[PDB]
Subunit: 27 residues, 5 copies
């Protein structure tokens, strides 16, 4: 169940990577 | 098992998006 | 043992990325 | 198993993160 | 191999802190 959190964390990193990308476009 | 597969997926997605960032800073 | 370290680091990378998103929206 | 992929992808991400560093410096 | 996963993870946080410094540098 330690793995569950790693899996939820990678998913967030993928969302956070996208907003960073979108923002750079907004520049 | 099913959870290593998810990580490997996500890692794949991450590398693809780190690359996008890199090409965007390169560009501008 | 190393599993929990990994889980720590990941939560951290989330907050750091998350922090990065705040700097970008700042200017 | 797949750990060869995680390892590699991590290995690869530091590469890509090092590059981001270079381009914020050199730029 | 885990160490590699543990070493690289450590390394990324530094590299991010490193990137956050440069964005807070200019």
């Amino acid at each position: 169940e330690q793995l569950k959190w790693i899996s939820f964390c990678l998913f967030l990193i993928c969302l956070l990577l996208l907003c960073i990308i979108f923002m750079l476009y907004r520049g």
